[PDB]
Design an enzyme around this catalytic site. Structure first.
Site, PDB file in Angstrom:
ATOM      1  N   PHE A 124    -134.716 -43.363  22.019  1.00  0.00           N
ATOM      2  CA  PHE A 124    -133.306 -42.411  21.882  1.00  0.00           C
ATOM      3  C   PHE A 124    -132.641 -42.868  22.857  1.00  0.00           C
ATOM      4  O   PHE A 124    -131.552 -43.245  22.753  1.00  0.00           O
ATOM      5  CB  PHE A 124    -133.508 -41.013  21.936  1.00  0.00           C
ATOM      6  CG  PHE A 124    -134.471 -40.684  20.588  1.00  0.00           C
ATOM      7  CD1 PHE A 124    -134.674 -41.535  19.580  1.00  0.00           C
ATOM      8  CD2 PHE A 124    -134.709 -39.101  20.282  1.00  0.00           C
ATOM      9  CE1 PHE A 124    -135.310 -40.842  18.369  1.00  0.00           C
ATOM     10  CE2 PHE A 124    -135.357 -38.717  19.331  1.00  0.00           C
ATOM     11  CZ  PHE A 124    -135.634 -39.560  18.234  1.00  0.00           C
ATOM     12  N   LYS A 128    -124.674 -44.812  20.938  1.00  0.00           N
ATOM     13  CA  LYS A 128    -124.554 -43.647  20.495  1.00  0.00           C
ATOM     14  C   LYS A 128    -124.039 -42.635  21.570  1.00  0.00           C
ATOM     15  O   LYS A 128    -123.308 -41.798  21.530  1.00  0.00           O
ATOM     16  CB  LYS A 128    -125.868 -43.017  19.950  1.00  0.00           C
ATOM     17  CG  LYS A 128    -125.964 -41.734  19.865  1.00  0.00           C
ATOM     18  CD  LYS A 128    -127.226 -41.216  19.203  1.00  0.00           C
ATOM     19  CE  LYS A 128    -128.514 -41.570  20.029  1.00  0.00           C
ATOM     20  NZ  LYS A 128    -129.774 -41.075  19.340  1.00  0.00           N
ATOM     21  N   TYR A 129    -124.622 -42.774  22.884  1.00  0.00           N
ATOM     22  CA  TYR A 129    -124.185 -41.884  23.941  1.00  0.00           C
ATOM     23  C   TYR A 129    -123.027 -42.294  24.700  1.00  0.00           C
ATOM     24  O   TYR A 129    -122.402 -41.001  25.082  1.00  0.00           O
ATOM     25  CB  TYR A 129    -125.335 -41.714  24.928  1.00  0.00           C
ATOM     26  CG  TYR A 129    -126.635 -41.404  24.310  1.00  0.00           C
ATOM     27  CD1 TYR A 129    -126.546 -39.805  23.878  1.00  0.00           C
ATOM     28  CD2 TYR A 129    -127.744 -42.010  24.596  1.00  0.00           C
ATOM     29  CE1 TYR A 129    -127.765 -39.444  23.541  1.00  0.00           C
ATOM     30  CE2 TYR A 129    -128.908 -41.426  24.140  1.00  0.00           C
ATOM     31  CZ  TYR A 129    -129.076 -40.291  23.420  1.00  0.00           C
ATOM     32  OH  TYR A 129    -130.181 -39.813  23.185  1.00  0.00           O
ATOM     33  N   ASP A 131    -134.953 -21.633  21.252  1.00  0.00           N
ATOM     34  CA  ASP A 131    -134.540 -22.290  19.987  1.00  0.00           C
ATOM     35  C   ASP A 131    -133.081 -21.883  19.715  1.00  0.00           C
ATOM     36  O   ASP A 131    -132.648 -20.826  20.022  1.00  0.00           O
ATOM     37  CB  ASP A 131    -135.175 -21.982  18.716  1.00  0.00           C
ATOM     38  CG  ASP A 131    -135.296 -22.544  17.561  1.00  0.00           C
ATOM     39  OD1 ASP A 131    -134.982 -22.127  16.450  1.00  0.00           O
ATOM     40  OD2 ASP A 131    -136.196 -23.564  17.528  1.00  0.00           O
ATOM     41  N   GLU A 138    -127.386 -33.537  18.892  1.00  0.00           N
ATOM     42  CA  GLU A 138    -127.983 -34.648  18.502  1.00  0.00           C
ATOM     43  C   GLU A 138    -128.953 -34.791  17.613  1.00  0.00           C
ATOM     44  O   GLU A 138    -130.164 -35.510  17.657  1.00  0.00           O
ATOM     45  CB  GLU A 138    -128.383 -35.674  19.838  1.00  0.00           C
ATOM     46  CG  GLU A 138    -128.483 -37.019  19.656  1.00  0.00           C
ATOM     47  CD  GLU A 138    -129.491 -37.390  20.742  1.00  0.00           C
ATOM     48  OE1 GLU A 138    -130.223 -36.537  21.470  1.00  0.00           O
ATOM     49  OE2 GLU A 138    -129.908 -38.654  20.952  1.00  0.00           O
ATOM     50  N   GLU A 150    -133.017 -33.659   9.141  1.00  0.00           N
ATOM     51  CA  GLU A 150    -133.691 -33.042  10.517  1.00  0.00           C
ATOM     52  C   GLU A 150    -132.983 -31.702  10.627  1.00  0.00           C
ATOM     53  O   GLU A 150    -133.312 -31.264  11.772  1.00  0.00           O
ATOM     54  CB  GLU A 150    -133.521 -33.872  11.636  1.00  0.00           C
ATOM     55  CG  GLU A 150    -133.951 -35.231  11.451  1.00  0.00           C
ATOM     56  CD  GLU A 150    -134.122 -35.864  12.879  1.00  0.00           C
ATOM     57  OE1 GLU A 150    -133.567 -35.545  13.790  1.00  0.00           O
ATOM     58  OE2 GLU A 150    -134.596 -37.200  12.933  1.00  0.00           O
ATOM     59  N   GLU A 176    -132.989 -26.200  24.675  1.00  0.00           N
ATOM     60  CA  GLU A 176    -134.302 -27.129  24.363  1.00  0.00           C
ATOM     61  C   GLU A 176    -135.412 -26.418  24.086  1.00  0.00           C
ATOM     62  O   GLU A 176    -135.728 -25.371  24.908  1.00  0.00           O
ATOM     63  CB  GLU A 176    -134.471 -28.244  25.453  1.00  0.00           C
ATOM     64  CG  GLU A 176    -135.663 -29.113  24.880  1.00  0.00           C
ATOM     65  CD  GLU A 176    -135.463 -29.894  23.536  1.00  0.00           C
ATOM     66  OE1 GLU A 176    -134.983 -31.014  24.009  1.00  0.00           O
ATOM     67  OE2 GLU A 176    -135.861 -29.542  22.560  1.00  0.00           O
ATOM     68  N   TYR A 234    -138.618 -40.179  23.082  1.00  0.00           N
ATOM     69  CA  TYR A 234    -137.287 -39.911  23.485  1.00  0.00           C
ATOM     70  C   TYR A 234    -136.725 -41.232  24.311  1.00  0.00           C
ATOM     71  O   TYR A 234    -135.477 -41.403  24.206  1.00  0.00           O
ATOM     72  CB  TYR A 234    -137.455 -38.698  24.553  1.00  0.00           C
ATOM     73  CG  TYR A 234    -137.687 -37.268  23.954  1.00  0.00           C
ATOM     74  CD1 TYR A 234    -136.353 -36.903  23.011  1.00  0.00           C
ATOM     75  CD2 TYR A 234    -138.583 -36.524  24.026  1.00  0.00           C
ATOM     76  CE1 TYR A 234    -136.477 -35.497  22.674  1.00  0.00           C
ATOM     77  CE2 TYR A 234    -138.712 -35.364  23.461  1.00  0.00           C
ATOM     78  CZ  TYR A 234    -137.496 -34.873  22.865  1.00  0.00           C
ATOM     79  OH  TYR A 234    -137.729 -33.504  22.384  1.00  0.00           O
TER      80      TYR A 234
HETATM   81  N1  LIG Z   1    -133.508 -25.322  16.844  1.00  0.00           N
HETATM   82  C1  LIG Z   1    -133.568 -26.208  17.963  1.00  0.00           C
HETATM   83  N2  LIG Z   1    -133.184 -25.551  19.226  1.00  0.00           N
HETATM   84  C2  LIG Z   1    -133.146 -26.555  20.139  1.00  0.00           C
HETATM   85  N3  LIG Z   1    -133.673 -27.645  20.498  1.00  0.00           N
HETATM   86  C3  LIG Z   1    -133.780 -28.294  19.133  1.00  0.00           C
HETATM   87  C4  LIG Z   1    -133.861 -27.717  17.944  1.00  0.00           C
HETATM   88  N4  LIG Z   1    -134.189 -28.340  17.136  1.00  0.00           N
HETATM   89  C5  LIG Z   1    -134.255 -29.389  17.565  1.00  0.00           C
HETATM   90  N5  LIG Z   1    -134.085 -29.427  18.862  1.00  0.00           N
HETATM   91  C6  LIG Z   1    -134.164 -30.855  19.788  1.00  0.00           C
HETATM   92  O1  LIG Z   1    -133.098 -31.798  19.343  1.00  0.00           O
HETATM   93  C7  LIG Z   1    -133.531 -33.147  19.512  1.00  0.00           C
HETATM   94  C8  LIG Z   1    -133.253 -33.663  18.434  1.00  0.00           C
HETATM   95  O2  LIG Z   1    -133.246 -35.252  18.779  1.00  0.00           O
HETATM   96  C9  LIG Z   1    -135.018 -32.742  20.280  1.00  0.00           C
HETATM   97  O3  LIG Z   1    -134.997 -32.881  21.610  1.00  0.00           O
HETATM   98  C10 LIG Z   1    -135.530 -31.667  19.658  1.00  0.00           C
HETATM   99  O4  LIG Z   1    -136.550 -30.903  20.404  1.00  0.00           O
END
Ligand SMILES: Nc1ncnc2c1ncn2[C@@H]1O[C@H](CO)[C@@H](O)[C@H]1O
Ligand SMILES: Nc1ncnc2c1ncn2[C@@H]1O[C@H](CO)[C@@H](O)[C@H]1O
Lengths: 609, 6, 4, 294, 610, 6
Positions: free
Chosen positions: E305, E311-312, E397, E413, E422, E370, E302
Site C-alpha cells: 500500500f 494515491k497518497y 474501531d 483509505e 471493504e 486504527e 501494508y
Molecule cells: N472500523 C475500522 N476502524 C479503524 N480502522 C479500520 C476500520 N476498518 C478498517 N480499518 C483500517 O483501515 C485500513 C484499510 O486500508 C487498515 O489499516 C485497517 O486496519
C-alpha cells in the site's frame, strides 16, 4: 550446516543482527516483546498502559523479518497456570504475541514445552492456527531431559526418560498433528538412552538447541563435545535440522564463533543416498506396468541401475553354464524368453550373459507396450538381428512358436508382487520346458512396523476431493522413508516361486516383538529375490544390495496411529486378494489394539490385471 | 518419480 | 582447535 | 548405388526401352530418406545388386515420373520438386535441379503433354505449373481448399490437366484461360486420362469406387483407390491399385478381368510393360516387385 | 521472443534439430510418425506390417524430447471422415500417435482444426486426456481465415459467418472437451487478416502459439522478409500475451538464409509502464479480495500500500485543497482543523495529512484511529519518535470509538477494487457522529463500474479454484482480485453503485450492455472511481485509469455457466449489494440474453464481515 | 499478494 543464535536480550535489534551475522549465524531467535514486560489485559490501571507495547516493524525490512528472525514467546506467559487471572492474562498475551509474529511474518516461532500439562497452550495455539491466514512454523521447545531430572543433588531433605517425549506427544495430539507444529529439541549434558533418541529422530524436528554449557573444553581451550554428543549431532545432521546455540560464552578467552566453528567442523567430519536425495519422505504411487504404459523417462531410471542388470546377467550366465555342458557348447541352443522386455536392458543382459558363458541362445523379447515395442524393434533392426525375435503381445495372451529353456523377467515391484509378477509368470509358464528355469525363481516380501509423524502427515496431506476422505490411508506408497522410526525387525510376508508346478491369494500373520515404547504409524515393505541359486537382489535394510536404487520401500499406512508399550507384541495380518480382473492387498493390525481392515475389496487401491 | 513409484 |  | 534400399517402394515406371524406374522411401526407422533405382533388367528388381543405376535422395520419394527418356521428376517430402537426369552411360543418376517452392509434402507430380512443363500438387493446397527447361515455376494456383491428392496431365492437350483434392473437388485446368479451373461436377483419390479418348477420364475415390467421366462406376476395391493406370493396348485395360493390398485389371466397361493379391502391404504403383503389353509390374510397401500376366 | 520451426520433413532427427537450433529456433514442431506412412489397424494383410512403426526414442535424450520437440499429428488421420473404415483407422492411429507422444514426454502436440465437424477428434482427445498420466499440452492448429476462404478466384463455374467461422470451430471443439486446461490454440495467421473485433475474440482465447507462414511475409527494397502494418499490429498484440511464434513453410526469400524470418520477429520484439512492471507475474492470477475490517493485515500487506506514491499524493492534494477552503488566510494562525485519519494504517495517510497541512501552512490537530493492534504498535512508535503531541493515536474501531471532539475533515483509505467491498460505507457511517456539520469526508464519493468480459483462461482459473470440503461450485460465487490480462471485454463499463460521504447501503442496479460482437460471456470486471476532493480523483476504470497507480487491480465476478451472446444482443445483468447486521455481500444474475441463477444468495459463498 | 488481493 545452518545455525542460529538464541538471544533473550536484544538491546538494539539492528546492532544485534549485525553482531550475530558477523559471527556466522544464519538466523536469530529473539523475543518480539520484552521478556520482562508483563502486560495486563483485564484490570485497570495497568490494562490501560500507554505508549507502544513493543518495537516497531520498521527496524528491519520485510525480507529481514520473513527470513532472519525466529520469534520467542515471553517466559512469563503461562497459559496453563493454576491461577485463573494468570491463566487468562497468559492466554491474551500469547494471542497478542502470536498475532504480532504473524503480522511481522516471521518464518518460525519458538514456544516452550517445559511441563506435563500444556493443554491450554495447545488450545490457544490451535485456535491461532485456524484463525486468519499466516504461515509461521511453530517450533515447540522441548528438552531431551526434563529440567527437574538434570538438577543437582543439593537439597538435603529432598516415565523417567520417556517423559518429555510424552509431553510433546500429548501436545501434538491435542493440536491434531498439525503440519505447522514441529520440535526444537534441547540437548543437555545428560543424554538419554539410544531407543529414546530413535523416537526423538522419528519426530518433526526442525531445530536442535545446544546450550554452550554442554560443551566441554579441550587442552587448547576451545569448545568441543563428548563422543556421545558428537554421535547425536551426526544423527541430527542426517535429518538436516538447524542448530540453535543458546546461553553465554562459557569459553571467554575465545570468541563466540568457536562453538559455530566446531559445529561446521563436525559438519565436514560427517550412491543410494545421492540418488535418494530430494526424494526423502516424498510419497509416490507405486508403478503399475501391466495396467499402464510407462514413459521412456520411466524406463530410463530403470536402466540407470547397473547392479540389477549385472545381477540378472550373472544369473543367466550361471544358468546357461548349468544347462549346457562344455561338450555340447556349440550344437545346443537355449531358448530364452525375456518377458516384458522393456526398452532393451534384459535382452542386452541375456546377450552378454550368453556371450561370456560362450553358449548359443535363441531369444524372444515379449513386450505389450507398443511404444516400447518401437524401440525394441529399432534395436532388433539395428543391433540384435535375427537372434532376437521381438513379440508385441502380453505373455499371458501370447502363443509361443516353441517352448523356452529360461524365461527372464523384471516384473518385481518394491513389495515383490504388487506388479503382478505371479499372475504374469503363471500365464507365461505354459511355454516353458519341463526342466525350464525362471529368473527370478524366488521372491519374498518383508514387513516391519514403523513410526513416523512426518510420514503420517504426508499421508493425511494426500487427501483428495471426489474421493473417500480416508482412501489415502488404504494405499501403499513408494516412499524413500527417511524421518521415521522402525519398531521391530522385518519379517517375511509372502513368498512366490517360479515355475509353480502345483492360488496367488495369500494370508499372513506377523508378530513383531516391540522391545521399546513407540507409536505405530505404518508398515514398511521390502523384498528379497533369488534370481538364480546364489544371485539375489534385496532391498531389505539388512541385506540391501549395495548401490541398488531401483526400488524404494513400500509404506502401508494405518488410519489411526496405535500407541504401543514396551513388551507389547504388534500382531498384524496381510491378505493378497484377487479376482478375475484385479489384485489388491488388505491389512489389519490385530494386537495390541485392533484396526479396521484397510482396503477391503480393493476399494482404494487395486492392481489391474 | 524414482524407486518404482510415479 | 577442533581436537577433542 | 547405395548398398541397400528402403522397404517402402513408392513408384515404378517403365520407359520406352522397357527399363524400370523404382522410387523408394524409408517411412520407418532412423532415416526417412529415399532413393532412385534404374533396372534395365526389370526382373532383377528389387535386388539392389543387379541394378543399372541408383542414387540416394535427401528426403522421401512421394511420387515420380519420366521426363522423356533420361529425366526423372521427383516429388519430395521436403517440398522440393527435383529433376534428376540419367548420365549418357546410364550408370549414374545426377541431379539437375531441386527447387523448394511448396510449403509442404509435394503429394503428386505430372508432366504436361509437351514434355517441357510439369504440374505439381502439394499438401500446401497450391498447385504449381513448372517450366522444366528454365527450372522455375510458371504459375501457382491456390484453388482447392485442402491438400491436393492427384494431378493428371492430359496426353493430348498440353495446357489441360486435372486435379483432385481432399475438399471433394475434381478441377479441369486449361492454363490458357484467364480463370483456368473448372469444377468437374466420397473424396476423389486418383485420376487418369484415357489414352485414346480426348475428353474421357477415370477417377477412383476413397471408398473403392472407380468411375468414368466424360469431360459408369464400379466398386472395384474395398479401400482407397491409390492409382489408376491404363494399358498401352488400342482398347485399354485399367489397372486399379488400392490400400486393401490388391490389384485389379478392368476392361473398357469397368468390369473386372484380373485380380492379384500378391502383395502383403499397400500396393503403390503399377506400370504396364511397353515391350510385353500383357505384363503388369506393381510395387508395394512390402518391398515386393510383382510382374503379373494379365 | 521464443520461436519454433514447423517442419513436415525430418530425414534425420539429430541433424535436423541441430540445424534448426543453429538458426535460432527454440523448439521444433515435427511429426513423430512419418506423415505419409499410413498404418492399417483392422484389415489384413496390411494390419500385420512388420518392423518398427516409427523411429526410436533413443535418437534424442529424454530432456531433448521433453523440452525441444512439439509433435504433430499425421495429415492422413481424419477421425471425422464420413467413410467408416477411414474413421476407425484414424481413431486408432490418433490414439497410437498421441500415446507415443505421451511416451516420448513431449511438452506439446499439434492437432488440426481445419473443418467444421471435429466431434470425433474431440472425443478421442478427451479420452486420451482422461487415460493414464501424461503432461503434454494439445495445441489445436486453427486458422485465422478458413482454408476455403483463402483460395484464389480462378474457378470459372465456382465463384468465391465468413469471418467468425474458425473461431466457431475452436469454440465447439473446446466446449466438447469441457474447457480443458491442456487444450490450447496454435493460431495460423494468413495473408488476409479479419476485422479488429474478430482479432479481439481470438486474443481472449488460450493462444499458446502463433503460426506464421513464410508466405505472409512481404519483401523489402533490400529483399528481406517483412510483414504488413496490419500484420505487424497483430504481432504486437500477440507479443503481449507472450505466445510463441512458429514459422512454417519454406524459405520464400531464397537469397538470404532462413534466419531472416526469425530476425524480423526478434526485431519486432525488441521494438514493442510502471503498472506493467508491477503487474508482471500477476496476470490472470486470481487472488482473494482483502478484508481489512475482519482480518488484520500483515506488515507486508501494508508495505505494498505504501509503495504507491500516486494515491497518497492525491490524498495529500485533497487535504491541501480542503484545508485551504476551510481556513481563510486571515484566520490562518488561529484556526485548528481537527482531522481524523480513520484506519490510519502504519502511517502513510497521517504523513500525507501532515505534509498537506505543512504545504497549506495551516494548523491541524490530528487523530489517527486504527483497530489493528499490530499496526497501532507502528503508529505509536511513529508518534513517540516523530509526530509527538500533534497526532493522537487511537486503538479503537471508528464505529465504536468515542471521540473527545468533532472533526473538520475525516480521511479514510477504505476503498477496495470495487469501491465498497471493504465496507467503507458501513465504517464511514459510524464515523459521522464525530464529524462537524460543515465537516468534510475524504473520499467525498465513490462509484463502482462493471463491464462484461470473456476469457476462457479466467474461467478455467475459477474452475481450478474448486476446493474440497465446500460447495463444488462456490468458486463461481466469489469475486476475485485479478490482473485480468488474457480476456476480451464485451462492452464499455457502466456505473453500478454510488456512495457519498457524509450521508441504507443496500443497493440494486440493473445494467444493460450493448454487444457488437459474437462472444461467450464468462464474467463481469468491476472497477471504481472516487472523488476525494473537488477535482482530485482516483480511478482504476481502464479509460480514466490514474497513471501508474497500482494499488488496485480490477475485481472479477464470474458466472457459473458461460452465456453465449450474439451480435446486437444486449447483456442485462443485475447487481445487489445486500447486508444484515453481521455481514455484507454481493449478489448478481444475468437476465439477458439468457438468464443465469442469482450468484451468491445470502452470501453463502462470499461475505464481507462487519 | 498485490492489487488489494491476498
Ligand atoms: N472500523 C475500522 N476502524 C479503524 N480502522 C479500520 C476500520 N476498518 C478498517 N480499518 C483500517 O483501515 C485500513 C484499510 O486500508 C487498515 O489499516 C485497517 O486496519
Ligand atoms: N503381461 C505382460 N506382457 C508383456 N510385457 C509385460 C507384461 N507385464 C508387464 N510387462 C512389461 O514388463 C516390463 C517391466 O515391468 C515393462 O516393460 C512392462 O511393460
Amino acid at each position: 550446516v545452518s545455525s542460529g543464535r538464541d538471544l533473550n536480550c536484544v538491546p538494539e535489534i539492528a546492532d544485534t543482527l549485525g553482531a550475530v551475522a558477523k559471527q556466522g549465524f544464519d538466523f536469530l531467535c529473539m523475543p518480539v516483546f520484552h521478556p520482562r514486560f508483563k502486560r495486563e489485559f483485564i484490570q485497570e490501571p495497568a490494562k490501560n498502559r500507554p505508549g507502544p507495547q513493543t518495537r516497531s516493524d520498521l527496524l528491519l525490512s520485510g525480507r529481514d523479518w520473513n527470513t532472519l528472525i525466529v520469534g520467542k514467546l515471553s517466559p512469563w506467559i503461562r497459559p496453563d497456570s493454576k491461577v485463573e487471572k494468570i491463566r487468562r492474562n497468559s492466554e491474551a498475551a500469547m494471542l497478542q504475541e502470536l498475532n504480532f509474529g504473524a503480522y511481522l511474518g516471521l518464518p518460525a516461532f519458538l514456544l516452550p514445552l517445559n511441563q506435563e500439562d500444556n493443554t491450554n497452550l495447545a488450545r490457544v495455539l490451535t485456535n491461532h492456527i485456524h484463525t486468519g491466514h499466516h504461515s509461521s512454523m511453530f517450533w515447540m521447545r522441548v528438552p531431551l531431559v526434563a529440567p527437574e531430572d538434570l538438577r543437582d543433588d543439593i537439597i538435603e531433605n529432598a516415565s523417567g526418560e520417556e517423559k518429555t517425549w510424552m509431553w510433546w506427544h500429548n501436545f501434538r495430539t491435542l493440536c491434531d498433528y498439525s503440519k505447522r507444529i514441529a520440535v526444537a529439541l534441547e540437548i543437555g549434558a545428560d543424554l538419554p538412552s539410544n531407543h529414546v533418541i530413535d523416537r526423538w529422530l522419528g519426530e518433526p524436528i526442525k531445530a536442535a538447541i545446544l546450550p554452550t554449557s554442554i560443551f566441554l573444553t579441550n587442552k587448547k581451550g576451545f569448545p568441543v563435545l563428548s563422543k556421545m554428543h558428537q554421535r547425536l549431532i551426526f544423527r541430527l545432521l542426517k535429518l538436516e535440522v538447524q542448530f540453535i546455540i543458546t546461553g553465554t560464552n562459557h569459553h571467554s578467552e575465545k570468541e563466540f564463533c568457536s562453538y559455530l566453528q566446531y559445529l561446521e567442523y563436525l559438519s565436514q567430519n560427517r550412491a543410494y543416498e545421492l540418488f535418494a536425495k530430494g526424494y526423502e519422505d516424498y510419497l509416490q504411487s507405486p508403478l503399475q506396468p501391466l495396467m499402464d504404459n510407462l514413459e521412456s523417462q520411466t524406463y530410463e531410471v530403470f536402466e540407470k541401475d547397473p547392479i540389477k542388470y549385472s545381477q540378472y546377467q550373472q544369473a543367466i550366465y550361471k544358468c546357461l553354464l548349468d544347462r549346457v555342458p562344455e561338450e555340447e557348447k556349440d550344437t545346443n541352443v537355449q531358448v530364452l524368453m525375456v518377458l516384458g522386455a522393456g526398452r532393451g536392458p534384459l535382452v542386452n543382459a541375456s546377450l552378454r550373459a550368453a556371450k561370456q558363458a560362450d553358449r548359443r541362445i535363441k531369444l524372444y523379447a515379449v513386450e505389450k507396450n507398443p511404444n516400447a515395442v518401437v524401440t525394441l524393434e529399432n534395436w532388433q533392426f539395428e543391433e540384435w538381428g535375427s537372434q532376437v525375435t521381438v513379440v508385441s503381445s502380453d505373455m499371458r495372451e501370447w502363443v509361443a512358436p516353441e517352448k523356452a529353456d529360461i524365461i527372464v523377467s523384471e516384473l518385481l515391484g518394491s513389495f515383490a508382487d504388487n506388479e503382478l509378477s505371479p499372475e504374469c509368470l503363471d500365464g507365461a509358464q505354459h511355454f516353458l520346458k519341463d526342466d525350464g528355469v525362471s529368473i527370478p525363481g524366488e521372491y519374498t516380501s518383508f514387513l516391519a512396523p514403523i513410526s513416523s509423524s512426518k510420514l503420517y502427515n504426508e499421508v493425511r496431506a494426500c487427501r483428495e476431493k471426489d474421493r473417500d476422505p480416508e482412501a489415502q490411508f488404504e494405499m501403499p506408497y513408494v516412499v524413500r522413508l527417511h524421518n521415521f522410526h522402525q519398531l521391530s525387525a522385518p519379517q517375511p510376508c509372502f513368498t512366490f516361486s517360479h515355475p509353480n508346478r502345483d492360488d496367488n491369494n495369500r494370508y499372513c500373520t506377523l508378530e513383531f516383538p516391540v522391545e521399546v515404547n513407540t507409536v505405530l504409524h505404518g508398515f514398511a515393505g521390502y523384498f528379497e529375490t533369488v534370481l538364480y541359486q546364489d544371485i539375489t537382489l534385496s532391498i531389505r535394510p539388512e541385506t540391501h544390495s549395495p548401490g541398488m536404487f531401483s526400488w524404494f520401500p513400500i509404506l502401508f499406512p494405518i488410519k489411526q496411529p496405535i500407541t504401543v508399550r514396551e513388551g507389547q507384541t504388534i500382531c498384524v495380518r496381510f491378505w493378497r486378494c484377487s479376482n478375475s480382473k484385479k489384485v489388491w492387498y488388505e491389512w489389519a493390525v490385530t494386537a495390541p489394539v485392533c484396526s479396521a481392515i484397510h482396503n477391503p475389496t480393493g476399494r482404494s487401491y487395486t492392481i489391474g490385471l | 518419480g524414482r524407486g518404482r513409484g510415479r | 582447535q577442533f581436537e577433542d | 548405388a547405395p548398398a541397400c534400399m528402403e522397404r517402402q517402394l513408392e513408384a515404378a515406371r517403365y520407359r520406352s526401352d522397357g527399363a524400370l524406374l523404382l522410387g523408394a522411401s524409408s517411412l520407418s526407422g532412423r532415416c526417412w530418406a529415399g532413393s532412385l533405382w534404374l533396372f534395365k533388367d526389370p526382373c532383377a528388381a528389387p535386388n539392389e545388386g543387379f541394378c543399372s543405376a541408383g542414387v540416394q535422395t535427401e528426403a522421401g520419394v512421394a511420387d515420380l515420373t519420366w521426363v522423356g527418356e533420361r529425366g526423372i521428376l521427383v516429388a519430395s517430402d521436403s517440398g522440393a520438386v527435383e529433376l534428376w537426369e540419367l548420365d549418357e552411360n546410364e550408370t549414374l543418376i545426377v541431379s539437375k535441379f531441386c527447387k523448394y517452392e511448396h510449403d509442404d509434402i509435394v503429394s503428386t507430380v505430372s508432366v504436361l503433354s509437351s514434355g517441357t512443363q510439369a504440374v505439381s500438387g502439394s499438401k500446401d493446397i497450391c498447385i504449381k505449373v513448372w517450366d522444366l527447361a528454365q527450372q522455375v515455376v510458371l504459375s501457382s494456383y491456390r484453388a482447392h481448399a485442402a491438400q491436393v491428392t492427384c494431378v493428371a496431365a492430359s496426353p493430348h492437350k498440353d495446357s489441360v490437366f486435372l486435379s483432385c483434392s481432399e475438399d471433394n473437388r475434381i478441377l479441369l485446368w486449361d492454363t490458357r484461360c484467364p480463370k483456368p479451373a473448372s469444377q468437374i461436377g466420397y473424396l476423389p483419390t486418383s485420376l487418369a486420362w484415357h489414352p485414346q479418348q480426348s475428353e474421357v477420364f477415370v477417377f477412383g475415390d476413397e471408398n473403392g469406387t472407380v468411375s468414368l467421366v466424360d469431360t459408369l462406376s464400379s466398386a472395384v476395391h474395398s479401400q482407397c483407390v491409390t492409382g489408376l493406370v491404363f494399358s498401352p493396348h488400342s482398347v485399354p485395360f485399367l489397372a486399379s491399385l488400392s490400400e486393401d493390398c490388391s490389384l485389379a485389371v478392368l476392361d473398357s466397361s469397368l468390369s473386372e478381368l484380373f485380380r492379384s493379391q500378391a502383395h502383403r502391404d499397400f500396393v503403390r504403383d503399377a506400370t504396364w510393360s511397353p515391350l510385353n503389353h500383357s505384363l503388369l509390374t506393381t510395387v508395394g510397401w512390402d518391398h515386393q516387385v510383382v510382374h503379373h500376366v494379365v
